[PDB]
């Protein structure tokens, strides 16, 4: 119940033969997994972190210019040459300057003039890559136990370290069996297209090709104290004002320009371990060995009293918190739901089956009431605690919200949203294959399109669809216009 | 700026997005439109930086 209150949770409920259900973790939301006889637990991918990062390429952000040396030839003969030109550390440029008797040359006319300065770089920008060998995912799993201090408690949990070498690490929950994780960590944010821009103690996960296409001069990338820099011509600005001579000026410090050139990148915390916090992971949940505590306990026949007022969460759960008043401590809590004094039992306990483990140890229950009046009976007898509640909503509204949530998931996850909570099945396989093919084609088409250009192109294409009448309307409009507007209204995550 | 000069158009100067001030050579000037330098980053609707 470290999952309550996040506002991003989403409940997986299915189960199959061998009781395996694959769910997807996104660093933002915490999954909840309910089952018929398995204790409902919750999962959250805490932090993805890498280690032993190599440096692929180094970029200069600002420079200093010293030792400006110049040389000119007599006009109409030869071309100005300078021994310092061949040096890798020196930036040079050739220009033509008028010369005459005033300048000492014999014959009037334009003559070449080369100026060579010393480009000693400063404030490098390292660009680091990570191999899949060292990437590590940490996963936290908690079963709904009804402990006193376990409402959205970020700390207490069970951690399982997942690495590509050994990706089938199974958690060992106390008194609940062993939840088995068999996940593929190769999929996810493809780290073969990630270069970390460690630039003055701020990292970023940019695309590889975009990093290679940064105009700033690039170094060899090896570990040296005086690396040679290629493409130095664009961070020093030679200025030939009029035609008498030319000066040499260093451009400046490119940090502010870099920060606005990274306006779409995702930030990652870089201090010590480069613990990335954005990303997603697909994992299978093998719940065969997993059991629930105290299925055989007797029922409670005593008084129950609320110790904290019931307050509905964002998704409809109400978080009942009660304390036992009887003398039989190792006992099971009863439950009942009536809509309009009718035992329709149209409710559900997101907790598996809450049980009191001590006489006066408070226990908290997460129940899902129906959409109307819902009288909830906890104890038995005339002393049964009665929690009146009223969930304000409609069933169709919940379906619309679920559809919107699924659409957002399909927009963020490429096609793994088709596997999120996909309990086996053959229909989901065909859906995933179709979506994979069409999404690959669609992203190959709309590679690197603006937040507003997507909306504009979508409007234009849906208008084209509404115009054409050769049954191109039906596919053009539906397949491109609506999809592209929906995407372009979401892309800026 | 930084021992350099340029002859820019007045309106273009007045248009560029940087935090300006009265330029009265007094101490502790108050800058307008400070939001052009600071960038607040709410990560997971958990906290702000």
């Amino acid at each position, epitope marked *: 119940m470290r999952c309550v209150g996040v506002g991003n949770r989403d409940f997986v409920e299915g189960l199959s033969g061998a009781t395996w259900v694959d769910v997807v973790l996104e660093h933002g939301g915490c999954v909840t997994t309910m089952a018929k006889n398995k204790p409902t637990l919750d999962i959250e991918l805490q932090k993805t972190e890498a280690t032993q990062l190599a440096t692929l390429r180094k970029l200069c952000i600002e420079g*200093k210019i010293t030792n400006i040396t110049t040389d000119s030839r007599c006009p109409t003969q030869g071309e100005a040459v300078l021994p310092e030109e061949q040096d890798q550390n020196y930036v040079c440029k050739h220009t033509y300057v008028d010369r005459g008797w005033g300048n000492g040359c014999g014959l009037f006319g334009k003559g070449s003039l080369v100026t060579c300065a010393k480009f000693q770089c400063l404030e490098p920008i390292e660009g680091k890559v990570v191999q899949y060998e060292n990437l590590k995912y940490t996963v936290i799993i908690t079963v709904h136990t009804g402990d006193q201090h376990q409402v959205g408690n970020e700390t207490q949990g069970v951690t399982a370290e997942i690495t590509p070498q050994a990706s089938t690490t199974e958690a060992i929950l106390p008194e609940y069996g062993t939840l088995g994780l068999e996940c593929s960590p190769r999929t996810g944010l493809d780290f073969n297209e990630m270069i970390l821009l460690t630039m003055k103690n701020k990292a970023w996960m940019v695309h590889r090709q975009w990093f290679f296409d940064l105009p700033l001069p690039w170094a060899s990338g090896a570990t040296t104290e005086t690396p040679t820099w290629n493409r130095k011509e664009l961070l020093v600005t030679f200025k030939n004002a009029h035609a008498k001579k030319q000066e040499v000026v260093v451009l400046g410090s490119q940090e502010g320009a870099m920060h606005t050139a990274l306006t779409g990148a995702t930030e990652i915390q870089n201090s010590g371990g480069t613990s990335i916090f954005a990303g997603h992971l697909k994992c299978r949940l093998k719940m065969d060995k997993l059991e629930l505590k105290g299925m055989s306990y007797a029922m409670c026949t005593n008084t129950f009293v609320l110790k904290k007022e019931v307050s509905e969460t964002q998704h409809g759960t109400i978080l009942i918190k009660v304390e036992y008043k009887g003398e039989d401590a190792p006992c099971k809590i009863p439950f009942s739901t009536e809509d309009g004094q009718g035992k329709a039992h149209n409710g559900r306990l997101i907790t598996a089956n809450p049980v009191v483990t001590k006489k006066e140890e408070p226990v908290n229950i997460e129940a899902e009431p129906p959409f109307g009046e819902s009288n909830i009976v906890i104890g038995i007898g005339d002393n049964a605690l009665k929690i009146n509640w009223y969930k304000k909503g409609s069933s169709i509204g919940k379906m619309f919200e679920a559809t919107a949530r699924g659409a957002r998931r399909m927009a963020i996850l490429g096609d793994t949203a088709w596997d999120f909570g996909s309990v086996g099945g053959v229909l989901n396989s065909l859906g995933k294959m179709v979506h994979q093919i069409f999404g690959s084609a669609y992203t190959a088409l709309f590679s690197g399109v603006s937040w507003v250009m997507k909306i504009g192109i979508g409007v234009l294409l849906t208008w084209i669809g509404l115009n054409s009448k050769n049954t191109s309307m039906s596919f053009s409009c539906i397949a491109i216009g609506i999809i592209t507007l929906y995407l372009g209204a979401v892309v800026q995550a | 700026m930084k021992n350099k000069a340029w002859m820019v158009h007045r309106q273009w100067f007045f248009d560029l997005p940087l935090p300006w001030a009265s330029g009265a050579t007094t*101490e*502790t000037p108050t800058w307008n439109r400070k939001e052009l330098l600071v960038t607040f980053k709410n990560a997971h609707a958990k906290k702000q930086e």
Partner: antibody
Amino acid sequence: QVELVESGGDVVQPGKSLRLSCAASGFTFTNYAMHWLRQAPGKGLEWVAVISSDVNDKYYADSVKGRFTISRDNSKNTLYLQMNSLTPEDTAVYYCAREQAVGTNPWAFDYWGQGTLVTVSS
Amino acid sequence: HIVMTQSPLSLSVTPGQPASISCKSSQISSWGSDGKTYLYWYLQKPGQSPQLLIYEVSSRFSGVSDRFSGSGSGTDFTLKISRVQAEDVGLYYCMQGLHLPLTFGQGTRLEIK
């Protein structure tokens, strides 16, 4: 590229006051808090006094509190330290530290001056 | 008046070897409002003026070699050097910037063994 050069350091007998001056260059001075730090020979670095961006606000180390005075001539781009009632203990190499260029602390050191030596002895 | 105690007082290490310097505080230097930890590490090279290596607990300063990295959360901070060169001779004075009367440590010394 910033250059902080010391001035005013010389010999002085105990009890005779002295005024130190820190000349600054390479940055806009009026926006930077400045510090005075000293290192007695063979002793750890010991911060002396700080003046913030606004001229009025100043603070001094308790070991030297009430004996020194720190002033800012930002129009001339220089810092002033006034040493009064000097003690033979108060002999050290004195430094001039700028405010941090990047960070969160209102007062920090990023660039240290070349250093001047003041000797208080008889 | 937080007093800074450093664990090592002399560190003689051969070149191409790691090194660990410890600067232990008398109080947690973690500013509550921002959650940062203001501990600085300077190096005064012999016959030179002090530099600034790591301007936080672990975020190194500009112009510093690749090997200098720090750590520590509340009171036990470290300065890790990966491969010692011949230029690392100096005095690694740590410092706390949490409180106004900021005080340096005694400062360790590094020499080539």
